[PDB]
Amino acid sequence: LSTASVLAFERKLDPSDALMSAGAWAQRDASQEWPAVTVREKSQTVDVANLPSDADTLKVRFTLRVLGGAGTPSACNDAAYRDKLLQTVATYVNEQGFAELARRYAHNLANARFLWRNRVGAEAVEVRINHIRQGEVARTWRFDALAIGLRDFKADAELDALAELIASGLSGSGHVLLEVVAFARIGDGQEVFPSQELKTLYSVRDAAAIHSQKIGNALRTIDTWYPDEDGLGPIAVEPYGSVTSQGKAYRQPKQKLDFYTLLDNWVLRDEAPAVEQQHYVIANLIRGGVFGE
Amino acid sequence: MDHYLDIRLRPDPEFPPAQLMSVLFGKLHQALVAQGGDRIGVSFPDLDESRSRLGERLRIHASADDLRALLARPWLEGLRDHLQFGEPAVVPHPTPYRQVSRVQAKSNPERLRRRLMRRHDLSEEEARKRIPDTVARTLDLPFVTLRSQSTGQHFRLFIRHGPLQATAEEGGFTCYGLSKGGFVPWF
């Protein structure tokens, strides 16, 4: 028994492209006709997006689909390896649920980390999260995203209810669609930070926006078990868990704590790692990607 | 100035430290605009003039009441997850002194063209022959990248630390913290 030559997992937790709009504070519950942030050009010619001079609140909106079935690959050569991996994820699920992982994902949903440079320097940010069962709303969460810190994973009753909903979605016990709206208080005429293309800015049709993979990278920023340090905080879950900014790679394969060696020890040789590393590798299986030769 | 405060940039995966020092210097400029005064200076004790780096430290010099005031203001709201604080204490003895100067250049010829054609009513060619394209000055100084609020423009500001002296003299400071005659203790 060895690993399969092709192996591919579809991503779970599909985010949408986060659209940007602008308005004034305390119109936050009337934020349905708010005009969108228009990208304009100015003098080298650079495209920048600013809030209008009568608006201090940037509203970003996206949707998130929690689907489930995180253990089954989308493509696999070997059948015995596939059955071994499926029963391994089955014993992981029977040991503990998705509760730690959904708790961390609900934390990253709670704080407005998906606002990357639009969160820094904001005086007040607020997150509204609607679980939408039918065509209408079924549950609402309201969070002060400045209260949830970017370093620690706390506990809160509304946050635990949100995490229970996300863990129910990840277990395949129900279909989860969330709508995430976030309000940021920056000021009048200030600039916003949408994603940049290959200087030009990312735009859905006459509206500034963020890439969906950017929101997805922010949402899986849960990895707090890398053996180099922990005082920096969480990072995004990656095989050879690295960051593009620092230019350095944690989970180096010289150390026995990357994703691939952990998966080969757990599935083939039945050397089950520590439970935080089990959380890490299951988070990578939720993240998806191309594994194998 | 008797009292110094060291704020350290927390090492961050989500942004490089140049961007955090950019936004920290910008909110420092906005806070010094909001307080006014000219007896408030800055220094960067993690200098490295070989690779022209600004390091990870920011040392603000003033009195005791100014620093204990600047702790409790909303210029630290929204940033305190991304940086660590120190304690406002006395500068030890003995220390040298040096300056923090803003050193720009006329590295854009086109602004000099606009100046020479707006004051003299020249042509494009007379302005081109008067000042050539070799006027662009190169700099090996560390820089901070800030933007503007009302009429928004993003620019790099070069910081130059002057020569180490043995005594300091009187002098003011701008809203950027830069030296206008007053020197900061280097340690």
- Is there a contact between A243 and B16 if contact means CB atoms under 8 Å apart? no
| Alpha helices, H only, chain A | 79-95, 99-110, 157-170, 212-219, 259-267, 275-287
Q: Tokens 């803003």 belong to which residue?
A: B102
In angstroms, the CA B178 to CA B60 distance is: 11
Q: Is B158 buried (19+), middle (13-18) or exposed (0-12) by CB count in 10 A?
A: middle
Q: CB of A55 within 8 A of CB of A38?
A: no
Left if phi > 0, otherwise alpha if psi is -120 to 50, otherwise beta: which for A19?
beta
Main-chain phi, psi angles of A276, to 5 degrees: -70, -35
Resolution to 1 decimal place, in Å: 3.0
Which sequence spans correspond to the domains of chain B?
3-104+137-185
Main-chain phi, psi angles of A6, to 5 degrees: -115, 145
- A122 touching B (Cβ < 8 Å): yes
Count Cβ atoms below 10 Å from residue A198 Cβ, excluding itself.
4
Main-chain phi, psi angles of A139, to 5 degrees: -150, 150
- Is there a contact between B149 and A187 if contact means CB atoms under 8 Å apart? yes
Nearest to A232 among B11, B15, B78 (CB): B11
Burial code (b: 16+ CB inside 10 Å, e: under 16) for B47-64 equals: beeeeeebebbbbbbbee
Write the CA distances from A275 to A96, A191, A222, A231, A280, integer angstroms.
10, 43, 15, 20, 9
Q: Which residues contact A154 (CB under 8 A, 6 or more apart)?
A: A107, A148
- B8 touching A (Cβ < 8 Å): no
Q: CB of B186 within 8 A of CB of B96?
A: yes
Which sequence spans correspond to the domains of chain A?
1-10+70-97+222-293, 11-69+98-221
- A152 touching B (Cβ < 8 Å): no
Architecture of domain B3-104+137-185: 2-Layer Sandwich (3.30)
- A187 touching B (Cβ < 8 Å): yes
Q: CB of A285 within 8 A of CB of A74?
A: no
Breaks in chain B, after residue numbers (C to N greater than 2.5 Å): none
- Is there a contact between B14 and A245 if contact means CB atoms under 8 Å apart? yes
